[PDB]
Amino acid sequence: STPTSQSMGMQIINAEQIKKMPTGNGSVTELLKNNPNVQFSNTASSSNIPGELAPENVSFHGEKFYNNNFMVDGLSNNNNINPGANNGELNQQPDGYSPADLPAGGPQSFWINSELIESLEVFDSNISAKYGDFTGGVVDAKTMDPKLDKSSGKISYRTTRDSWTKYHISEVISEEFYSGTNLYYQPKFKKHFYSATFNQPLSDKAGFIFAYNRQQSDIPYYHEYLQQWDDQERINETYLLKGTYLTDSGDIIRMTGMYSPHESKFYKKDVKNGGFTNSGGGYRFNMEWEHNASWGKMTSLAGYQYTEDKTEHEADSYQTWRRFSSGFVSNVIDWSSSGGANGQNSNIGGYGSFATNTSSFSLKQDYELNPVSWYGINHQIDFGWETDFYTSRYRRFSDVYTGGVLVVPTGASAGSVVCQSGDELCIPGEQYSRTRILYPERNVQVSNVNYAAYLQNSMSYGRLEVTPGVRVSYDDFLENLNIAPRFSASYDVFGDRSTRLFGGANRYYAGNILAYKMRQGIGSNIQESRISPTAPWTTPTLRTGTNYNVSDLNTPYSDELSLGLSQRVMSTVWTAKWVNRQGKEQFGRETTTIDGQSYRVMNNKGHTEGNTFSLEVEPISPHRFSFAEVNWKLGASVTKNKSNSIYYYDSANQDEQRVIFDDKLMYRGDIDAMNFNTPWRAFLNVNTYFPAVRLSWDQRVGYTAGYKGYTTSSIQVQCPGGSSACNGDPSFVGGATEYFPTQYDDFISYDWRFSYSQPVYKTQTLDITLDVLNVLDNVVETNQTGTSNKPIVIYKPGRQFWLGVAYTW
Ligand SMILES: CCCCCCCCO[C@@H]1O[C@H](CO)[C@@H](O)[C@H](O)[C@H]1O
Ligand SMILES: CCCCCCCCO[C@@H]1O[C@H](CO)[C@@H](O)[C@H](O)[C@H]1O
Ligand SMILES: CCCCCCCCO[C@@H]1O[C@H](CO)[C@@H](O)[C@H](O)[C@H]1O
Ligand SMILES: CCCCCCCCCCCC[N+](C)(C)[O-]
Ligand SMILES: CCCCCCCCCCCC[N+](C)(C)[O-]
């Protein structure tokens, strides 16, 4: 059995516990909301953005949001190229809009639905040497296994809508919002979730399981100027197939296969054929071999996993044409993109396709030895190793041409454009392009190999438990070998199990980013010119634009200290604990100069702190108090998190800037963190079951410290005189931007889930499921944008209904 000091710092959510928490989009990170050690992006749940299907972003003890280890079925599900794009916030032009974009796709490469999952193991504190490639938390999601006894199976269906959603939108925006001209202002929409599961035995000793799961979301979108309604789309799919076979020997062989594409359908604004789609996800193949020997257990795995973020546009060339201007009106340009009174231009097309992928083959092996007493104490030993050979690419699939400067001869020479038979950049009689920019077919490619091994020894003298462990890893990307001591202890103060202390000190090293590699060539373009529209294209010249590059880096780590205490007061367990995290050597941005050419490059100048006091109360067993039965759980936390100005790996170092902030003139690097920094929150869950009418009545209540919004001075406060804070440093001379707080008040969150089951033909049932999400519909500020000039507040979703129908057998 696992050591008591490590369980103290992990969560376990089995499938029946999952079904009893009320949910929107079922997604992995959503399930973390009952964990007092985690926080979410200020924008992660917002009323502007239903219809969106991605996973929320999460940060453990205020560590980076892209420094978590997300696993599925114990294997990595992390994007190690570009996971923290735009520090996790959305972009009015999602990445791929523009020709020279590095695709994003976020911290998880497979977006797995909250069905499909048997158990979720969530480690945040005193983590095991067995787990690496994180600074923050570990989030292992175990999919459904086959059963060998019966032929289970289920078909579900589930939906929500704009009708059914009550919105909260600022005014200021409400005009623009309801026009539906903004991608991420979605007033009208429909989500649809299908699922199908087949459990299937073959022998007394072998069976498989097929599962499928589709989430889809349609969002209308309008072009002013172009004057068209197009439909945005969001599709997530998961196909899953697992066999298991028990040998004559008593050893076990498993085999998994997964395919988890997701895509997002977008539109370049007011552009004829402006469409483009952003595919993500990929697939897996496992093969796993348990062996049960006299000494212990030995599980040996081989795996392969292709994952890919690709942007693909409706067309592979882009033009900007003129509809009309002084002296000119086209017979051929129907549409417009601008609406100027005296001049209108018309954009058409797009920037080809292009992508990043990672192909990777993995070989794990883990040993669980049987306990062994030696020199008077028990030795639970684990050890193991693993190695991963991977290859990352970026590719533009084919040459994409953009139109350059325009000509529109008018007046004396008004009709005189004479085109070439094939010429995509010439409209006979009207207009042509003098220059033309070619973004070329390209390819950049890394192939690497990481190695890791770990040894742990949980020893116990009775009363005591003390588990020193080591994880050693080497990435040949940075070529660093890192050694991570993990230490975790526990003491029982009087037999009993009534009163136990525990603590520990550990170090977690992160995995790779490697975006700066993939961007190396990126944004190369070759521009040509021509005198007339029958001249040949003449003077090709290669520009690179912003150049990116590799540098000599340390691997970012996080150091931990923990101390806690678990009391059993009555028939109710009160466990309270402290954790502190120094996050160190965190990647950021530098501009460096090589040969007169300049280069964006990664540094190790970021840093973070995390400090959390967490309490947790939970009764021993449910109350049967009588005609129904009720269980309950209660979490709470107090949380101070810190940060540089280096928010993520593409943030430049603006620490030495001077900034006014709360009343006194100070350096920017020392100001409060403004994402993942809610000072406290408490939450209670109550699951109620009325067996008399087969009705489940699940409620989540929560009281939460309010948001604190900031805005900034549009104009820098110049400083010898010009603010009475300039005296905080009389010598200082220069500018400084002032931050203006608005402290919103603490708020009550309240969520419901009903689930009624109903027999149909003996062994079958039909299940009705209803979620009421913001029950009181009360308004809460989540996030604040803009200068003081124009401040914009964003709110948490109002009351929302989800309706589900399941059919089991
Ligand atoms: C279980 C074995 C996997 C079977 C899935 C085969 C279908 C994969 O389809 C492919 O997947 C990649 C990422 O999704 C894309 O980049 C490819 O262009 C696409 O054709
Ligand atoms: C768990 C600890 C294992 C240590 C292995 C260190 C390997 C360092 O050795 C390097 O590894 C590269 C990638 O594998 C090779 O291609 C290089 O030739 C070699 O310099
Ligand atoms: C068994 C008792 C568990 C509680 C451990 C006390 C942890 C105190 O630890 C301290 O907490 C401060 C917060 O006020 C932080 O400012 C400091 O960084 C930290 O050293
Ligand atoms: C038994 C379940 C198998 C899943 C069937 C999925 C069928 C659709 C495959 C994708 C094709 C696109 N579209 C829009 C028709 O769905
Ligand atoms: C892991 C076993 C699952 C195998 C399923 C293979 C998917 C077949 C492709 C059908 C079309 C899928 N897509 C992307 C169009 O939706």
Residue numbers in the entry: 59 to 867
Quoted from the paper:
In our current work we have identified the outer membrane receptor responsible for ferredoxin and pectocin import in Pectobacterium spp., which we designate FusA. To understand the mechanism of ferredoxin import we have solved the crystal structure of FusA and two of its plant ferredoxin substrates, and using nuclear magnetic resonance (NMR)-driven molecular docking we have modelled the FusA–ferredoxin complex. The discovery of FusA demonstrates that, like their mammalian pathogenic counterparts, phytopathogenic bacteria can use a TBDR to specifically target iron-containing host proteins. In summary this study reports and the structural characterization of a TBDR receptor that binds to iron–sulphur cluster containing ferredoxin domains.
Recombinant FusA (derived from P. atrosepticum SCRI1043) was expressed in E. coli and purified and refolded from inclusion bodies to yield stable, monodisperse FusA, which was used to undertake crystallization trials. Phases were obtained and the structure solved using platinum single-wavelength anomalous dispersion data at 4.2 Å from a K2PtCl4 soaked crystal, with the final atomic model refined against native data to 3.2 Å resolution. FusA possesses a classical TBDR-fold, consisting of an N-terminal plug domain surrounded by a 22-stranded transmembrane β-barrel. Loops 4, 5 and 7 (from the N terminus of the barrel) are the most extended and form a wall-like β-sheet, which is separated from the barrel β-sheet by a section of irregular secondary structure. Large extensions are present at the end of loops 4 and 5, which double back over the outside of the barrel. Normal mode analysis (NMA) indicates that the structures formed by these loops move between an open and closed conformation giving the extracellular portion of FusA the appearance of a baseball glove. As with other protein-binding TBDRs and in contrast to those which bind small molecules, the extracellular loop of the plug domain is highly extended, with residues 144 to 162 exposed to the external environment.
